[PDB]
Symmetry: C3
Subunit: 253 residues, 3 copies
Amino acid sequence: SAWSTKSVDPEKAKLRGTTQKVNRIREITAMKTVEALQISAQLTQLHEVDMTRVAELRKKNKPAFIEKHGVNLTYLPFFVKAVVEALVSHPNVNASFNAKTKEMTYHSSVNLSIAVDTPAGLLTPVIHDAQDLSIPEIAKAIVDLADRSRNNKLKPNDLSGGTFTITNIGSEGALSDTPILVPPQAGILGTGAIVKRPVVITEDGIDSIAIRQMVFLPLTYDHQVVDGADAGRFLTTIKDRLETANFEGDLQL
Amino acid sequence: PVSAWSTKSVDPEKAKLRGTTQKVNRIREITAMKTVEALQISAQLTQLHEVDMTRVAELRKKNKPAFIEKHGVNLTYLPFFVKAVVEALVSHPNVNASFNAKTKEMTYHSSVNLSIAVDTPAGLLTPVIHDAQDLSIPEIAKAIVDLADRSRNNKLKPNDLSGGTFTITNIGSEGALSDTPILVPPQAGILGTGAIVKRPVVITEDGIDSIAIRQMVFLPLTYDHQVVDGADAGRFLTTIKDRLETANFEGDLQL
Amino acid sequence: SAWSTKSVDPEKAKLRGTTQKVNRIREITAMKTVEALQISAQLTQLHEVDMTRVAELRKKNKPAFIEKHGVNLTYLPFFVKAVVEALVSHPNVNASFNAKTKEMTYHSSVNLSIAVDTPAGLLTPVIHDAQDLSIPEIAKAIVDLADRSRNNKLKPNDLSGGTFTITNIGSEGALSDTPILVPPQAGILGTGAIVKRPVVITEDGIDSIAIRQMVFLPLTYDHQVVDGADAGRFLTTIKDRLETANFEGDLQL
């Protein structure tokens, strides 16, 4: 047959024609995501980042990174490091709003939530005090928290305290999405698929078309805490850090 | 013209509205009520994917004369999108589903009753193709022509409007690249088909990258996070994209 | 250090670790944007417009325009002129819905709200009866309203009566966003960053890849007032006006 089998799970065919009660994980993700949108003013701003230099740095230093630090070098610790630094530099984004008292709380800790796709459903463990971590420590924290999310070895403190979230919306091919932030958080950054795209490049003041590894970074922000220009300035810092790609010293090889 | 103002997609009949207050028709009043309510009782988000429609465009160009001669309807892109989406809803029963927030139970529908958004002068109408999973591309093309005609001429039947399990809306009919369409519970998804645009893209032939002109489309999927999470939305769209990019539809046209 | 300094305000570092009451402007923005989403059916339709001809017209006529009219010639009066003309042609978009009486009011005035980013927060002054204005008058109104927004010299009529809004979401680098409309308004058009992108061009029936100055125009519309097709037709008129770029007479040189 001409039907597509790509990303199709044959085991899900049994679901067809049935009514089944969902598990607690999914039941929580359902009542809480519906509520999140009603108690915040969410909007998603889109920026594109040229990941070609980070890709070249990753390709070059990955073998030594694996040998020294024991874990693989993916794109996620680069996104995490750039976002965590920008949350320190943009304290108005690493913040929570209280609609009753009209007070803004600017968190001194950057407790970064990481969305982890598991067979049981979406889980969002937190990297507490991520501002004190190096790229190797971030890479080991991701491996640890993702493993414990999939094998149900997460403590109650591992799921609380998050001040910002990062989610890989490009894990299943998406260019972008409008991820849902969960108050008290004021932002959630999605990392779209890193795709080769023709872009205009300027070298010595002359424009040319070149193939570059481009990513869309959609930021869902709460308009109660962050304005459009605030969201753009925060994303400009992240984009500048990633496009400059001065991370060789951060890898601690 | 005597002025530099644009006349493109301007309806001179709408000039009568300017400076007036009028009660909206029954279609508009319900669409206003339902869309406002829909967002308050669901967790909507729109995931975007791009699909290379060049092979479907080449197949359509080659087989359009024979399709119109045999089946009597024009061959548009919509039956290809409908066929790919209906097959993907069978393969992804978790998307062809409804959530009950009171009992926390998920119902996975055995029928794919595909809602089609039809723009009419009186407003938006959404007739349903019941049991679309049992239809061929020629039957789909005819059902679209029939339901669109009866929507515009107020001749829809009671069943033509109920039972929808998923919706497909042509947001590219009036030039849009993409949109964040509003899904209406009990449905869990609405796929929009953006405009098919010639865009320069990277093509990797035999391990070598090159820039080529391809007919690209954005397929925004609005999904309910109560029913579908980000990864399921991506897997569902990956199946649709793979079916459209492979473009093995020559037999499906039944010529 | 390798940290990015781009768009980082060192003065905001003082906020980190504190709880402070937000100012009147920010408290009202937070109240209005959370409420706006609950009393409307918002969705954002995206179109791209080739601004290359407007860029070439601007470059060519800017010296004469500044000399005659006394004000700079930016892209904003071209966007304002195209949107205001389209709101006259599409009275269904320059409208307000009353959900209690089910009546649509089609405004005869195009009172265009302009989003102005200020250090004290977002302000949205209104250009009343913008349909009667020329591009030189529009350019002067923008300079005046933006100045008085930043220097807190806006009067009560300057902030009321808006029938549509235009916001420069590309001011801090964004390609696009899903801006929040505020009822009674039914639409808010965002102007993304004007970026040089490689696009396909058809000259004498032959396709080629060329560098053009492209912009994304996201329109947030209220589905109570405007359908997807209505939004597309309204944006098609705007796109046609901008891509044709017949503004030489409008510059009143």
